[PDB]
Design an enzyme around this catalytic site. Structure first.
Site, PDB file in Angstrom:
ATOM      1  N   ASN A  16       0.800  -1.222   0.000  1.00  0.00           N
ATOM      2  CA  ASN A  16       0.000   0.000   0.000  1.00  0.00           C
ATOM      3  C   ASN A  16       0.838   1.281   0.000  1.00  0.00           C
ATOM      4  O   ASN A  16       0.618   2.139  -0.858  1.00  0.00           O
ATOM      5  CB  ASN A  16      -1.051  -0.001   1.124  1.00  0.00           C
ATOM      6  CG  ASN A  16      -2.076  -1.101   0.967  1.00  0.00           C
ATOM      7  OD1 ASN A  16      -2.408  -1.502  -0.152  1.00  0.00           O
ATOM      8  ND2 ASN A  16      -2.594  -1.592   2.085  1.00  0.00           N
ATOM      9  N   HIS A  53      -1.495  -7.177   5.916  1.00  0.00           N
ATOM     10  CA  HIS A  53      -2.740  -7.446   6.679  1.00  0.00           C
ATOM     11  C   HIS A  53      -2.577  -8.184   8.034  1.00  0.00           C
ATOM     12  O   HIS A  53      -3.479  -8.962   8.457  1.00  0.00           O
ATOM     13  CB  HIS A  53      -3.815  -8.142   5.811  1.00  0.00           C
ATOM     14  CG  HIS A  53      -4.231  -7.364   4.609  1.00  0.00           C
ATOM     15  ND1 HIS A  53      -5.017  -7.914   3.620  1.00  0.00           N
ATOM     16  CD2 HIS A  53      -3.928  -6.107   4.190  1.00  0.00           C
ATOM     17  CE1 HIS A  53      -5.234  -7.018   2.675  1.00  0.00           C
ATOM     18  NE2 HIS A  53      -4.571  -5.914   2.983  1.00  0.00           N
ATOM     19  N   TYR A  86       1.262  -9.479  -2.138  1.00  0.00           N
ATOM     20  CA  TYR A  86       1.563  -8.114  -1.685  1.00  0.00           C
ATOM     21  C   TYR A  86       3.089  -7.870  -1.725  1.00  0.00           C
ATOM     22  O   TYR A  86       3.514  -6.765  -2.059  1.00  0.00           O
ATOM     23  CB  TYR A  86       1.011  -7.825  -0.296  1.00  0.00           C
ATOM     24  CG  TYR A  86      -0.484  -7.607  -0.305  1.00  0.00           C
ATOM     25  CD1 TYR A  86      -1.355  -8.621   0.106  1.00  0.00           C
ATOM     26  CD2 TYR A  86      -1.033  -6.394  -0.741  1.00  0.00           C
ATOM     27  CE1 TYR A  86      -2.752  -8.421   0.079  1.00  0.00           C
ATOM     28  CE2 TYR A  86      -2.437  -6.187  -0.775  1.00  0.00           C
ATOM     29  CZ  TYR A  86      -3.276  -7.221  -0.350  1.00  0.00           C
ATOM     30  OH  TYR A  86      -4.652  -7.076  -0.352  1.00  0.00           O
TER      31      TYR A  86
END
Ligand SMILES: CC(=O)N[C@@H]1[C@@H](O[C@@H]2OC(C(=O)O)=C[C@H](O)[C@H]2O)[C@H](O)[C@@H](CO)O[C@H]1O
Ligand code: NA
Length: 754
Positions: A180, A230, A239
């Site tokens: 992210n 997460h 990710y």
């Protein structure tokens, strides 16, 4: 720095994302890359909303659904990519350019603007659109007006005023982390090129630094090379790759400029190529055990992800010192050359084609995957290799969720953290060929399983629940590893099992003890559930063959070994019944992912399992897997006490490998397994070479200050190598006491002299 530097930066990004500078004259792979670009572009053009006062840009994409809003913007940036790519059908096409410019204008007006509140998935507003919209500004920079730039930058700054943060205001904004953080900074950095904003650019660049700082909890890179995203899911393979891809592209973009990534701690990221990414790459594919919910995706597979990892590592390699560059190139040449199942250049973009071509031009030889063990205790994952195979174990524990589901993906994946034994082999399609569309998610290979049906999304989405188990962990000494998992069943059945694996250079011994449940249902343990594709692979026994008829489960008998054509051998280490089923299974990817196709895939499976029955009391299993073994070798597995079980019950589980002169053990309770003893939860592997005893020990709860072993093989008077305090107990036996404070499940290696 100024306008000259900003144009140079934009041009370098256009070069990077189009490959316009590196298309080779008459190259057939560059030709097939251009054709794929053409077809995607034409498809999009076919779906344009041509209507006066239209309320969408593409007739199959609703701007009121955020994922289709994202898709609208990616189609537009793809079209601008094509428009910018020499020899593309739409290269420099004024009419295509017009349609792109209108599409971006109407998407802005109708939907994505500085007056819009987020609706739906935050990821769409802040990462999905910004990256695509930024790329389109930069691609179209010579053609967009100052007023168009202003409006699209404004839209972007509205949703992402600070890439160090995420979420719309109405939610409470949190620190963006890991993949992210990278994606957020990417959209702002590319946006800063379009808008020539050095202030937002420097701040976005600064914000990459947090992603490669080591962590000891939560999301990021751990010192043992685990990567979690997460909080509770091992996630190197998806990710992890998004992170790796974004940094490869940004580092390369900015290198040499006033905006160069200059943080020396970025060397932690470079170390992660081999410390985190390479061990979980298997012949081109990221291991399913480290890619969380993406296993449910028909078109974002282990090979898609591993190919993306290859591109990124090749891109990064360009900037490294000569030794590191060549090593990484050798690793990539290896993952490419061994992958004849999904060759990387099939459907490759022009940039990926260029990097693969470049690699091939160095002549760097392919590096083989090293045999042996790579353990990732921080994320409950271990990797084991021998000639022809790679075993990936998938565990869960009070740190690691049973699974992640979310956004309608992997809702059925609740047993995937129940001790899966993925044996990857030369059957490169084993886990890729509609395995996750057709497999029995209640008999996944290796697991122990309470047959109570569970609802989709049991335990909740986003790995919000973890099993409250005693421990999961591992250690290894040379060619032999010891892995153990206290399995607590998902969906509050009260299933409990003690699963351990003892992995040598060729064979894997699986032991289970102490199996019960509160549900009243039968409990099974799955020796294997193997994708045969369309094959009728033979299951060969001492008697002759078993399970010739599909759908009719059969029970082995007293030869105790079975061989599966094209895989290898299996063998019972106790007198339990082995149930063998040949089955034909069907399902659609729509059945496991809300975005999956409805096409029905049909696959043949060999399913091999032990039935522990209703209400087992201290149920147990003992078996081994020998990937790649011939029938002759499989038949001989159980002869000569080669794999000699020592203990299998609720205190300890242990085997001796006769030929490796090595003994391995896991300990659940204070106790002894043969002449090895431990005072608390432990993994241990030991070997005596003459007058010297080598041991590898881990403290797998990750919470204990110390641990004491009771040494096998006689007495031991001095420490030759490593830490630990010797001693004698009440019975004249030698002890070794360790300070395991803060070890985080890591292995301690020790050597002792008689
Ligand atoms: C890692 C992951 O699952 N992320 C989700 C997105 O998936 C990825 O798409 C990209 C990219 O767009 O740069 C990289 C990977 O190949 C793929 O896994 C997914 O598209 C969005 C959809 O909302 O959710 C992310 O969490
Ligand atoms: Na989670």
């Amino acid at each position: 720095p100024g306008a000259a530097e900003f144009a140079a930066l934009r041009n370098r990004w256009v070069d990077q994302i189009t490959g316009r500078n590196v298309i080779q004259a008459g190259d057939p792979d560059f030709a097939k890359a251009i054709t794929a670009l053409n077809n995607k572009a034409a498809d999009s053009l076919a779906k344009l909303d041509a209507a006066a006062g239209r309320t969408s840009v593409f007739t199959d994409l609703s701007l009121a659904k955020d994922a289709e809003m994202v898709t609208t913007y990616t189609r537009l940036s793809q079209l601008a990519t094509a428009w910018a790519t020499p020899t593309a059908a739409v290269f420099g096409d004024a009419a295509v350019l017009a349609a792109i410019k209108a599409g971006l204008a109407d998407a802005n007006t109708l939907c994505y603007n500085d007056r819009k509140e987020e609706v739906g998935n935050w990821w769409s507003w802040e990462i999905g659109v910004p990256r695509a919209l930024a790329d389109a500004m930069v691609l179209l920079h010579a053609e967009l007006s100052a007023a168009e730039r202003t409006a699209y930058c404004a839209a972007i700054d509205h949703f992402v005023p600070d890439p160090w943060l995420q979420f719309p205001p109405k939610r409470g904004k949190i620190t963006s982390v890991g993949a992210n953080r990278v994606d957020l900074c990417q959209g702002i950095i590319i946006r800063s090129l379009a808008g020539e904003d050095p202030t937002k650019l420097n701040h976005a660049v600064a914000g990459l630094s947090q992603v490669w700082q080591y962590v000891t909890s939560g999301d990021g890179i751990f010192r043992d090379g685990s990567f979690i995203q997460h909080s509770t899911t091992p996630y190197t393979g998806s990710y992890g790759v998004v992170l790796l891809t974004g940094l490869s592209k940004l580092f390369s973009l900015l290198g040499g400029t006033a905006f160069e990534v200059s943080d020396p701690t970025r060397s932690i990221f470079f170390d992660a190529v081999e410390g985190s990414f390479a061990p979980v790459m298997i012949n081109g594919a990221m291991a399913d055990a480290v890619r969380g919910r993406s296993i449910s995706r028909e078109a974002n597979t282990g090979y898609d992800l591993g190919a993306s990892a290859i591109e990124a590592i090749l891109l990064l390699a360009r900037a490294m010192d000569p030794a590191t560059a060549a090593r990484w190139r050798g690793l990539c040449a290896g993952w490419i050359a061994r992958d004849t199942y999904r060759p990387i250049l099939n459907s490759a973009s022009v940039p990926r084609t260029a990097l693969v071509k470049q690699l091939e031009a160095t002549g760097v030889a392919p590096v083989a995957e090293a045999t042996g063990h790579k353990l990732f205790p921080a994320m409950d994952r271990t990797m084991h290799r021998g000639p022809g195979w790679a075993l990936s174990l998938a565990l869960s524990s009070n740190r690691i969720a049973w699974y992640e589901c979310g956004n309608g993906e992997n809702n059925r994946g609740y047993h995937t953290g129940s001790g899966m034994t993925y044996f990857y082999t030369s059957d490169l399609g084993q886990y890729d060929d509609a395995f996750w569309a057709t497999a029995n998610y209640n008999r996944l290979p290796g697991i122990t399983v309470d047959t109570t049906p569970l609802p989709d999304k049991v335990e909740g989405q986003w790995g919000a629940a973890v099993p409250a188990d005693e421990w999961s962990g591992a250690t290894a000494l040379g060619e032999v590893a010891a892995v153990g998992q206290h399995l607590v069943g998902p969906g509050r059945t009260g299933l409990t099992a003690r699963k351990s694996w003892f992995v040598s250079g060729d064979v894997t011994v699986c032991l289970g003890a102490d199996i019960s449940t509160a549900s009243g249902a039968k409990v099974e343990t799955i020796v294997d559930h193997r994708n045969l594709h369309q094959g009728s692979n033979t299951l060969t026994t001492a008697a002759g063959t078993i399970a010739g008829t599909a759908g009719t489960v059969e029970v082995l008998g007293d030869g105790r070994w079975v061989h599966l054509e094209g895989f290898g051998g299996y063998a019972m280490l106790d007198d339990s019944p082995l149930h063998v089923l040949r089955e034909t299974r069907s399902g659609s990817w729509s059945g496991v992912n809300i975005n999956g196709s409805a096409t029905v895939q049909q696959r043949n499976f060999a399913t091999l399992y032990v039935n522990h029955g209703v209400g087992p009391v201290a149920g147990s299993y003992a078996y081994m897997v020998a990937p790649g073994a011939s029938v002759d070798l499989t038949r001989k597995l159980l002869e000569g006490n080669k794999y000699s079980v020592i203990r299998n019950d609720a205190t300890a589980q242990s085997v001796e490998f006769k030929t490796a002169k090595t003994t391995a053990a896991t300990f659940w309770k204070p106790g002894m397994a043969g002449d090895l003893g431990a005072s608390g939860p432990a993994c241990v592997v030991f070997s005596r070479h003459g007058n010297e005893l080598s041991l590898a020990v881990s403290e797998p709860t990750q919470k204990a200050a110390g641990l004491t072993l009771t040494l096998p093989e006689g007495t031991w008077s001095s420490v030759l190598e490593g830490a630990g305090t010797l001693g004698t107990d009440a019975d004249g036996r030698s002890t070794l006491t360790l300070d395991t404070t803060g070890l985080s499940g890591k292995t301690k290696l020790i050597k002792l002299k008689r």
